[PDB]
Amino acid sequence: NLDKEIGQLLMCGFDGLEPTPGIIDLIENHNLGSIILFSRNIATPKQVQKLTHSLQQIARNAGHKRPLFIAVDQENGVVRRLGDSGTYLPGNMALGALGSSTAARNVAMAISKELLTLGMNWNLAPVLDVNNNPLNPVIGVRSYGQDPELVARMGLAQVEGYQRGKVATSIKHFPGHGDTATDSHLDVPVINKTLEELDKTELVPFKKALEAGGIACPTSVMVGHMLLPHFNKDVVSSIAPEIVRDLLRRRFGYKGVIITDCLEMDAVKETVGTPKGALMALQAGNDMAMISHTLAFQKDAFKVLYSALQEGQLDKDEIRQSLQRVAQLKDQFLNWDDVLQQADLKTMGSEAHATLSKELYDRVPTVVTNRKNTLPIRPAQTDKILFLAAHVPEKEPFNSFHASLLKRHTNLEYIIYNEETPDLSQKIQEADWVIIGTANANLYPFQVRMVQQAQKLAKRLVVAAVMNPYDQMCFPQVDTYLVTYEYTPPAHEAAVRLIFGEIETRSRLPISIPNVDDAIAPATFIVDDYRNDDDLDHVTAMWDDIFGKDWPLRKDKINLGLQRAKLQKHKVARDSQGKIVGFVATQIVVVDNKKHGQLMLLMVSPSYQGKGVGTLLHDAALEHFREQGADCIKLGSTYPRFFPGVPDDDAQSRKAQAFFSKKGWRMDDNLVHDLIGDLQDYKVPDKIQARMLKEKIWFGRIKPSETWELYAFQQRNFPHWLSTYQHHVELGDYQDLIVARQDDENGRVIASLILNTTHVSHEYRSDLIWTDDKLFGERSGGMACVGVAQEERGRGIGIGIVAHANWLLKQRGVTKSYVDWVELLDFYSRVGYKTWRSYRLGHF
Amino acid sequence: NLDKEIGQLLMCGFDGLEPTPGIIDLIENHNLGSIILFSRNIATPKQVQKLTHSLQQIARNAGHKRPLFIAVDQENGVVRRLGDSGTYLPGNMALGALGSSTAARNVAMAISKELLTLGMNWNLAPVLDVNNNPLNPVIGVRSYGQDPELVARMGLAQVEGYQRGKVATSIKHFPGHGDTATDSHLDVPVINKTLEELDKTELVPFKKALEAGGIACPTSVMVGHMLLPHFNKDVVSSIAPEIVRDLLRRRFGYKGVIITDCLEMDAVKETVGTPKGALMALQAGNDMAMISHTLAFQKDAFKVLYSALQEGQLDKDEIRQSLQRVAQLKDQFLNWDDVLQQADLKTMGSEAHATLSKELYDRVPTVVTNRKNTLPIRPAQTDKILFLAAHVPEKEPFNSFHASLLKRHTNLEYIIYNEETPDLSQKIQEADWVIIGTANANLYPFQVRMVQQAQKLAKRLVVAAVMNPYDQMCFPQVDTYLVTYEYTPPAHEAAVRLIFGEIETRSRLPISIPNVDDAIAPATFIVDDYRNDDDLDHVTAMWDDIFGKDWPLRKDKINLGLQRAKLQKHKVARDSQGKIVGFVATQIVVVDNKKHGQLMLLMVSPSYQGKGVGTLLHDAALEHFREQGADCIKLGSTYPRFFPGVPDDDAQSRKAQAFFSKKGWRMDDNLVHDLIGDLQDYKVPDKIQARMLKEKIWFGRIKPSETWELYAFQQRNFPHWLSTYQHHVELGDYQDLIVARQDDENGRVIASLILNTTHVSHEYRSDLIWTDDKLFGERSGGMACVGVAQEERGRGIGIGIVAHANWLLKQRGVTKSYVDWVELLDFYSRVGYKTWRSYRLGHF
Ligand SMILES: CC(=O)SCCNC(=O)CCNC(=O)[C@H](O)C(C)(C)COP(=O)(O)OP(=O)(O)OC[C@H]1O[C@@H](n2cnc3c(N)ncnc32)[C@H](O)[C@@H]1OP(=O)(O)O
Ligand SMILES: CC(=O)SCCNC(=O)CCNC(=O)[C@H](O)C(C)(C)COP(=O)(O)OP(=O)(O)OC[C@H]1O[C@@H](n2cnc3c(N)ncnc32)[C@H](O)[C@@H]1OP(=O)(O)O
């Protein structure tokens, strides 16, 4: 009935660097729909492309309707299956400490690119567990931090990032594994909390992800293994319908794929059979069962499901809906052509991703205490440095630390200390500097003793914790302590750079360290909602301060720009004393029925630039868009607008272009221009008069009863402008809506454009805001949305109607004319317009 | 201015039950604007009225422009000044535990009523401090609870309630005194937190309150005395401009009054002079200084300000702004007539408030643990009960507790234990039941010993913590433990009621008790936003369960009512398993440019009524209105609409009316009716045909070009209906818009009404939803917004246009006609309408 088809509901691993006979059977006979891989299987880039293609080949020959999913746990920091095949980029708490959702988004994009070229098309990530427990072993630095809002902010960003690169996601571990001291792999963790308690922390990031507007909403959710007595005290969360069906499916109304964590962990293997745990998972409402590692359970589980399917121990109607959800998920990401074609090995962003890693990691480690100003250290060449590193329970992970120390200082001793290590007192007292490397000392007593010992003896001690940042809770006497949030080579490089004062701590602890309350606070800026009643004068002053030379702009024009923005969301940045230091403007517009986010303006005061304020505001902007589902984002705005893209005619502006591309904005190669035209003594050239006379073209306004003819025109020929014409009509600016007609005032509309003139057009028209005496004057105007019908092209009408528009402006007393956002410079050269300012567009 | 005027910026108290020469001097000569009273000054209702009236007269007599403010700390739990002059109603944590914002609002209203009648017109309250510290001596139960969101919720509701009752407020203590173990009256409390930290908890309730839309936004804010080293490490927040101006005035942009806590507290007096401190307070940016007790300081402080005014040590410009803010505030609440009248002491709601006290306190105390099912106790008359209570550091608080037990049991011994108390072991073992009253045992070790002692010896133990609820942290072994949240007499009464099983625990701990993980969790219901894609069928089902008998209503009509709701915010209530058990519907509409909140519908499944679900949904709705500033609230809705008020034709609906009035809704004495009229064979009466023909009145549809004539009519004569007409015009239903014109189809508009007809009117018209075969059926229609110009009344037009309306409807094939929400029954009786259903309206 559904015997072969139920293979799509599974995900299974294997051992080695090429397909086993096991998984070949499962795929070919039992229609297995998803694979999972680990470092065991990741040989190296060439081997993996082959491996993924091999599995894919066998799947197609075996007659699968859709291609396999090939999943992996790529969380990036401490946990990372790529190894040396792919780039080291910051893991979760590292990113949390870094504090930029944009940074995290980019990391996920960079990773998905790498995974997709190798054949991975499903990253089991991100982790949305919240780390409010100092002693959490399993989810330590795998969580972004202690604050559920920070976890949401960063989580959404990565789900976007990964899925933006055509790779599926799984937010985990539902309902929240971050609050326990118990490890899921070893024992059964208990979360003794009610739904009300869960709503306040655990579920915050999950709720926010599920409610995301578009690409930032995850495509699957993973249910970990934890006991929740207030919901189900008999069985673990993955197989309890109170957690899966009642909470995730019913309450939250989640329509996507639900999958389990590995059913071979002791939390479910030592409560029931892993083949039994597979049945109870799908009974609870899971769409999918995970069985990584040991084949035998994979065989059993399959036969367990077949028999249960015969009885009626599985609701056949529910399994159909599950198979439907898995089909939908596959159709979103998978197609046979490019799944088999494979991409070239150089299409991994290896070089670009490498320079991202260097750039990010310099902003990661935190100096937590520095009571004696030991850091930065500036030893003399002949000073003896003792570097003591803890043993690990990857093999010698503190060797990269050692390497990085060597680049700065060679008179160095490197010892890996453990429980057995003979007494090192004498070395500690003799050395001029002692550096100790802890790795979860708060879980490994020998490290705490080592640090406490050295504290008594060392001349100058510094302690770097490279796993969880909580270690100093065990030795608060230590005056100088820092954290790297992960033991990766680049995290150690950055940690050494920090120690030698090459770099400066910019990150902020995403965590509380118990018994350590004098944490060092960097200068912090906070983002509030813009309040026009209170903030307008300051924003006005900021504009003149930054743009006043080339773009002087009075308070009311700024206010017009800002107050008329659709679905607006403007923010300011304030220092600790509430003084405004930066501003960002923002609107959302619908085009083709896609939400479009427009970043209208981003600016910060000169004396406060280069402190991360721009980045704060910028992230607040994209985080808002992200939640709203504004997935197509633009630099500058259409209407209303300060700039259509990024100014190009001064250095500070071009510098701001680099700022934006470096964050991930795709800037255009070519420029875009605003034109200026003198009309002092403008006459319509005779050739055009004669042409328009010969063609029998009529120009003039549209009347209210004729509006439909102008809308009909725009709908057929320039639908992207209809809303602009409609906006003016709402204000009653009919005198600015000029049309060309055939023969006379009753002929069909064959062309049109939008005039504007200072003091004539409605006060809420932002067509021309540059009315300062040093730019365009009082006696100023312009035109826009110029267009001729397709049928009527090549009769000289376009140049006619523009030339007429110039005449009309001259009639109104206009001496200086503004043609905004155009490219055909030779066209407007024929009627006296030379270029005024240039911009480079950007989008995302 | 300016020296006389500065007295308006001061608040001073005094000794006795009549004016001292001291304050008489301050009022008469120094222009003191505000008084503060304490228990010293309150003896009895009669004498307080005489006191407030005397103070008020002297101010009037002495030539004050505006009345004195008369302030008091009336927090209602452990902090009260009224004593027995006013009703005992639940203090803060009692209300947090109770869990209803409507209950907190209703308390404040009752208290502001009692205060005003005595001449007290400023309550220094509510406390928005968040109590996340288990050891907090000041601000224990004075805080609503641990969750800042709960504190905001209740805080807004009380600020509404007090100001609703024409009494001023001061939210306190900015920036948030909830997190310390140090007491402000004794020593300087330190809050070592950054702005970013404070924003997470301390400042949440203050921000929520400051951003409230209308009456729930507070009119003053008090700044406590606490050291914040990250902002200012030299002086306490009261006199630190980094807290007062930079944070409250600039960053939050608050425009109301800022006032200090008492400048006589040791935090201010023992750091710097109390006179000196008043100068620094106004320098920091405070509007108003408090000096509650000592005449010498009140005298000196004034002398310090007069000299400070001379130099220019005070920004004179800033003082004028302050004086204007005080003037603003006084003008909002105070006028000489009411302030000099002494309202009858019958107009204190004493008997009603007594009833409220009883009703609420039954929903207050919580049974926290009851492992042995000791509660409820059922002692035989001859059993011996021993009651041991802690000494206080009032009188003998647990006394009332003693009196309450006596009523249930005669054989009872009562001993107030302390440190000196000789051993009591013998009586404990001998007693059948032992009851121990603790009063912050976690602060007083002798109580912990006493409980530990009894834990082993006593036969059957129950422990009642009557101050802070945290006491069981000191003795988790105790199986049977309850808490009252305050030692007021009715809190104790309710506690005893719970002990003997007369009542049952309905509250939930608003707090976490350390070392007690097994709290008795009652079965709870959580409220989410209504999702129409998931919940429509269930809400439709729920409708049929509850109203299906007399009001059968199809899904699409329910969906129309709900989706067309303006500024909608609908909620559902689920149980732990996500099953929907209740629904509330809501919209906001603007009339006279005030926001009007409309409670469209409130319903819960029958099997789930009487479990607090209606209250949960109800409060969620009122919290939303309160925040939005929708201060005029209605039962039912205008357009769209299920009901215009509460139905009256069945018992369940009449019972639901009681439900609303108990919560404080004002229900009308009279009813309001929907009408039904059979048109099967209707004819226009001959007398009316004549009258119309005689008055030469013309009827017919309004044409699009004539729309302005209809709007002009409605504007001049029925402004409250304009928006409904406009709504129908947007849909294009001109064929339902009938007018009366003078002679002719071109005559002035003199009357109008709105028709509707099933399958003829636009699909989004909700005029008539009752189209079920058993109600009005498919051949159905109606009229609304029937109105004759005031200059044209008594020409039989009203009856003419309505008689015409029936005719037109009959022309359409309508047999049953719906006239909704009317009163003039005899009028519609003349055209064959009898009453169909009746509703009682309700407002707040
Ligand atoms: C569509 C439009 O909005 S167009 C208008 C854009 N505005 C302008 O053209 C002119 C005004 N420009 C500005 O206000 C600013 O220069 C902005 C908005 C472009 C950037 O604001 P800033 O606060 O300087 O940004 P931020 O401080 O995050 O700068 C990031 C860079 O500064 C450096 N930096 C930031 N903080 C630190 C720190 N604590 N220590 C050392 N270096 C730092 C980094 O190198 C970082 O990356 P990059 O050098 O690779 O670019
Ligand atoms: C605009 C319109 O909506 S028109 C109104 C139309 N709606 C209806 O008529 C629907 C029919 N009625 C109902 O659905 C419900 O009865 C409602 C909505 C009126 C009230 O909902 P309920 O859930 O019953 O209210 P709730 O349970 O909060 O309180 C009801 C009573 O039970 C009591 N109660 C609640 N929980 C408990 C408990 N755990 N133990 C003991 N008593 C309790 C309350 O104190 C209250 O007592 P009171 O009668 O002395 O005031």
Numbering used by the authors:
A (entry chain A), B (entry chain B): 8 to 400, 408 to 858
Paper text:
The full-length β-N-acetylglucosaminidase (RmNag) from Rhizomucor miehei belongs to glycoside hydrolase (GH) family 3 in the CAZy classification of carbohydrate-active enzymes and the characterisation of which has been reported in our previous study16. RmNag is a 858-amino-acid protein with multiple distinctive structural domains and the β-N-acetylglucosaminidase activity lies in the N-terminal region. In the present study, the crystal structure of full-length RmNag has been resolved to 2.8 Å resolution to find that a unique GCN5-related N-acetyltransferase region exists in the C-terminal region of RmNag, which displays glucosamine N-acetyltransferase activity in vitro. The crystal structure of full-length RmNag reveals two distinct functional regions: a β-N-acetylglucosaminidase N-terminal region (NTR, domains A and B, residues 26–529), and a N-acetyltransferase C-terminal region (CTR, domains C and D, residues 537–858).
The monoclinic space group of RmNag was P4212 with two monomers in the asymmetric unit. However, the β-N-acetylglucosaminidase region (NTR) and the N-acetyltransferase region (CTR) are monomeric and dimeric in solution, respectively, indicating that full-length RmNag dimerizes via the interactions owing to its CTR. The N-terminal domain (domain A, residues 26–371) reveals a characteristic (β/α)8 TIM barrel, which is typical for catalytic domains of GH family 3 members. The C-terminal domain (domain B, residues 372–529) displays a 3α/6β/3α sandwich-like fold, in which a six-stranded β-sheet is sandwiched by two layers of three helices each. In the structure of RmNag, a non-canonical His192/Asp190 dyad able to function as the catalytic acid/base is present on a flexible loop which is 6.3 Å apart from the conserved aspartate nucleophile (Asp268). The N-acetyltransferase C-terminal region (CTR) of RmNag contained two structurally conserved GNAT-fold domains (C and D). A co-purified AcCoA molecule was found in the N-terminal of CTR (domain C, Ala537–Leu693). However, this AcCoA molecule and the domain C are unlikely to be directly involved in acetyl transfer, mainly because there are no residues nearby the acetyl group that can be possibly involved in general acid/base catalysis. Consequently, the acetyl transfer activity must be located within the C-terminal of CTR (domain D, Ile711–Phe858). Most important, the conserved tyrosine (Y842 in RmNag) which has been predicted to act as the general acid to protonate the leaving thiolate anion nearly overlapped with the one of the HsGNA1–CoA–GlcNAc-6P complex and it is therefore within hydrogen bond distance from the sulphur atom of a bound CoA.
